[PDB]
């Protein structure tokens, strides 16, 4: 059963939200606690969702080390990703601690700072080359450097520098600009376009630290970000793509972080951008 054959299947019989809720009542579920302790309350955007306390990404600064982001590792596919929320106000610091610590080369964000007249996460890099910002709690100093604004996401070069040694690296920054307000892109090949851009940089490779992800609270939009690149992935690399059963792989990836697909929209979408983009493979 190649996977358009399914996907003619759902769409035919209206089962994306049975198949997405069947999902839901499958998925992990491990314990939070780290997330919960007060003194970590303002460090997250929404209270239900939280990172697992065993997949957690620890900040290296003594003091509190939280944050609210996850290692998801994908072994079969050989790639890492870190999903996080986005950024508040006073996390700014702490998500370039973390870009910094885990070695990361990209950053992809998948949402808007405000969207439908609402705050979805933080300014938190500099929008003008002569305005740099500095993170005065965690010690970190970030210039925009260049960007190259597209009709359907930008990518800018950024330079991230720890203070306390002076050492600097050049971080890209892959925002995808145009994700609807309400449900999901009509059709993939932006997402797709996207996608390969971030490829292609080298961003996702091995020698680096993984990939930071997020969007809003860094489990929807993000989630089929990490869903549509490690399906491809493991396409490429089985010697039969049609075995590739993408609710697997999102499980999988649920043993990581909680929640990733917020909808059946999106899950539908997901499998659209793997249909697609294992067309181009
Ligand atoms: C033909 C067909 C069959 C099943 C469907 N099931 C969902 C669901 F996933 F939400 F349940 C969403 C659909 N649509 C509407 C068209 N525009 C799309 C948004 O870009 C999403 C959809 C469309
Ligand atoms: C030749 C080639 C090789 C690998 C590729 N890998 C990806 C993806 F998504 F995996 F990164 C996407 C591709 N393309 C680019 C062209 N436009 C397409 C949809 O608009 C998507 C692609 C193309």
Redesign the pocket.
């Known amino acids: 059963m190649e996977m358009e054959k399914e996907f003619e299947q759902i769409?035919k019989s209206?089962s994306?939200?049975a198949i997405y809720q069947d999902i839901r009542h499958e998925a992990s579920d491990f314990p939070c606690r780290v997330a919960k302790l007060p003194k970590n309350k303002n460090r997250n955007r929404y209270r239900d969702v939280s990172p697992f306390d065993h997949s957690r990404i620890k900040l290296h600064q003594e003091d509190n080390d939280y944050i609210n982001a996850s290692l998801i590792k994908m072994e079969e596919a050989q790639r890492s990703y870190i999903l996080t929320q986005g950024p508040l106000p006073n996390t700014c610091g702490h998500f370039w601690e973390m870009v910094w610590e885990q070695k990361s080369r990209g950053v992809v964000m998948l949402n808007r700072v405000m969207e439908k007249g609402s705050l979805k996460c933080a300014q938190y890099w500099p929008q003008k080359e002569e305005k740099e910002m500095i993170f005065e709690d965690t010690n970190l100093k970030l210039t925009l450097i260049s960007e190259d604004i597209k009709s359907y996401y930008t990518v800018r070069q950024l330079e991230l520098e720890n203070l306390t040694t002076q050492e600097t690296r050049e971080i890209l920054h892959f925002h995808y600009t145009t994700w609807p307000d309400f449900?999901?892109?009509?059709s993939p090949a932006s997402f797709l376009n996207f996608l390969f851009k971030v490829r292609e940089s080298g961003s996702l490779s091995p020698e680096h630290g993984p990939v930071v992800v997020h969007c809003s609270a860094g489990i929807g939009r993000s989630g089929t970000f990490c869903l549509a690149d490690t399906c491809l992935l493991l396409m490429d690399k089985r010697k039969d793509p049609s075995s590739v059963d993408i609710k697997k792989v999102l499980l999988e990836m649920r043993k990581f972080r909680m929640g990733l697909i917020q909808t059946?929209?999106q899950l539908?979408f997901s499998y659209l951008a793997v249909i697609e983009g294992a067309k181009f493979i």
């Open positions: 769409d209206g994306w939200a449900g999901v892109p009509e059946a929209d539908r």
